[PDB]
Each structure stands twice: as structure tokens, then as C-alpha cells.
A paper describes a structure:
Amplification of [name] in the ping-pong cycle requires assembly of a tertiary complex scaffolded by [name], which simultaneously binds the N-terminal regions of Aub and Ago3. To promote generation of new [name], [name] uses its two Tudor domains to bind Aub and Ago3 in opposite modification and [name]-loading states. In addition to its self-interacting N-terminal region, [name] contains two extended Tudor domains: eTud1(272-512) and [name] (562-746). Overall, our results reveal that the two Tudor domains of [name] have distinct architectures that are responsible for the differential binding of two PIWI proteins.
To gain a detailed understanding of the interaction between [name] ([name]) and Aub, we undertook structural studies. We solved the crystal structure of the [name] ([name]) domain in complex with the Aub-R15me2 peptide that showed the highest binding affinity in ITC experiments. In the 2.7 Å structure the [name] domain adopted a typical Tudor subdomain and a staphylococcal nuclease (SN)-like subdomain (Tudor-SN) architecture. sDMA-modified Arg-containing peptide binds within a negatively-charged cleft between the Tudor and SN domains, and is specifically recognized by a conserved aromatic cage consisting of four aromatic amino acids Tyr624, Tyr630, Tyr646, and Tyr649, stabilized further by hydrophobic and cation-π interactions. In addition, [name] Asn651, which is conserved amongst other extended Tudor domains, forms a hydrogen bond with the guanidyl nitrogen of the methylated Arg15. Besides Arg15, other flanking arginine residues in the (G/A)R motif of Aub also contribute to protein-peptide binding. The binding pocket of [name] is similar to that of other Tudor domains and contains four aromatic residues that interact with sDMA. As sDMA modification of Aub signals its [name]-binding status, the binding of [name] to modified Aub ensures that the complex contains Aub/[name].
Author numbering:
A (entry chain B): 568 to 745
B (entry chain I): 13 to 16
The structure:
Amino acid sequence: IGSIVGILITFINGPTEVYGQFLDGSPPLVWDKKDVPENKRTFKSKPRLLDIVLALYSDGCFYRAQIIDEFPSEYMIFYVDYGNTEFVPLSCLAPCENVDSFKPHRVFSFHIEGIVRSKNLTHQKTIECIEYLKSKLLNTEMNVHLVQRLPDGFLIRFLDDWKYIPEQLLQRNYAQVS
Amino acid sequence: RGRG
């Protein structure tokens, strides 16, 4: 039915919130080191705040990122199609062409309905919950029920194949009910 | 393709 949409989870923002793309069949926006030879690897002007560039992630592949902060020795960057924040130096950055740069940003924020992060969650337990959700949901394609639109993003509810995830979060005291 |  029409309330069910397909999403790909790319990043775990918190115990009850993940970042992800809507599934529409279009291939991912990522570049091999083989498709970034060094003519395309150096800018005409040193990059700056809010510029949209290619950036090198831990997997050795380039992704679209926006510089959201600048310091003398590092940039702080946000991957616009994946939603994780990193710190990089200029050597990790490559100019991104306007045809690829103009494509809309694919990352959005989804909240699991009916649960929130536990108030008593310690720093360590928070890290551990993030790792559990990474083990289950990271880079996973699945249909979900788009319950609602929010100012932040979307409120989704899991279907029968993934409805155990909020149950486990409640069971493991990573989450409480809203 | 996507990250693993």
C-alpha cells in the first residue's frame, strides 16, 4: 500500500533515530580512487565553509560531503547522502563537479515511533546500543511504514520483519516508551 | 556498491 516506503539505513544517529535514503532504484553517489585521478584531485581555490566536495571515507571511496566547519589543521565535514560527520585534512578532499554536486542530498532522518532514548543511558551503554543497531540495520534495505512527517524528518514504524528492533531496545533498556 |  501507499503508506509503506522503501528506505536504506546509512548511519545510526542515536538510540531511536537513524539516517537513511529513500529507495528509488538510483545507483549510489560514490567514486573509486580509480575515478578520481589527480587532475580532478586538486582545486582552483582552497575549499571553505559550506563548499560541497568529494571526501574520502574509511572504505577508500569518495562521497559527497559539505564542509560544515573549518579550523587551521582540519575540516569538519558532513556526508550529504549518508549522514555521518568526520574530520579530514585537505588531502582527503577533491573537487566535485557541478553535475554531480547539483544532485539532491539523499540523506534524511527517521525516528522509530513510540520509543525514545532512556534517560538513564550512560555514555558506554549509548556506544553499545549504537553498535547493536549498526550490527542489525547499517546499510540494510527494508520497507517501513511512514507514520508521520516531522519538522526534523520522518516518523517511521517497522514492519513484521524488523518490529523486533524496538522491542530489543526496550528489553535492553536502551529505550523507554514515549 | 553501498557500504557494508
